[PDB]
Amino acid sequence: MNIFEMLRIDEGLRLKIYKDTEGYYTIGIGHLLTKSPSLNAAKSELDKAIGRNTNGVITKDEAEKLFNQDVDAATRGILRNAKLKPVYDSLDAVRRAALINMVFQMGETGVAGFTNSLRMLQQKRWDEAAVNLAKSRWYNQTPNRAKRVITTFRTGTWDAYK
Ligand SMILES: [Cl-]
Ligand SMILES: [Cl-]
Ligand SMILES: [Cl-]
Numbered sequence: 241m242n243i244f245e246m247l248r249i250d251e252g253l254r255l256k257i258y259k260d261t262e263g264y265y266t267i268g269i270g271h272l273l274t275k276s277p278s279l280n281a282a283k284s285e286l287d288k289a290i291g292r293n294t295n296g297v298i299t300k301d302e303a304e305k306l307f308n309q310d311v312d313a314a315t316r317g318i319l320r321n322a323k324l325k326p327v328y329d330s331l332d333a334v335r336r337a338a339l340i341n342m343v344f345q346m347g348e349t350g351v352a353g354f355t356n357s358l359r360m361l362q363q364k365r366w367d368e369a370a371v372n373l374a375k376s377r378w379y380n381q382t383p384n385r386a387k388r389v390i391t392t393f394r395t396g397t398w399d400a401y402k
């Protein structure tokens with residue numbers, strides 16, 4: 241397993257514009273297009289992202305390409321964030337993947353706000369961090385996915401994805 245396969249499992253793959261769990265226009269492997277309620281604003285962002293007139297539909301290669309960009313960008317954003325970088329650097333490879341997963345879903349800002357959990361993760365208090373992570377909108381809104389990520393931070397293994 242690796243970050244790519246992990247995200248592929250959590251986000252799925254859809255080739256036509258769809259709405260995410262929050263109601264936002266997305267495509268591919270969890271590539272958010274816009275928070276705007278307009279399908280037209282979404283198709284336009286799509287064409288700009290792809291470099292062609294898509295008419296709201298992309299190929300598998302294009303979805304994969306967006307995904308590669310988004311993972312890279314997620315990871316690099318973590319290294320550039322003063323609150324996240326130190327946590328990431330302290331983690332082992334498996335847990336690093338868990339933190340990238342949360343940043344991919346919720347944005348760097350969102351994650352950077354889990355101050356207490358980040359502190360427990362850096363201290364390697366796994367069970368305590370698992371408990372704290374769960375007291376969040378994140379966990380209540382997407383319980384299945386959050387548990388998978390939480391178990392990942394707790395155990396340092398990919399068991400939840402097997
Ligand atoms: Cl893009
Ligand atoms: Cl460095
Ligand atoms: Cl879920």
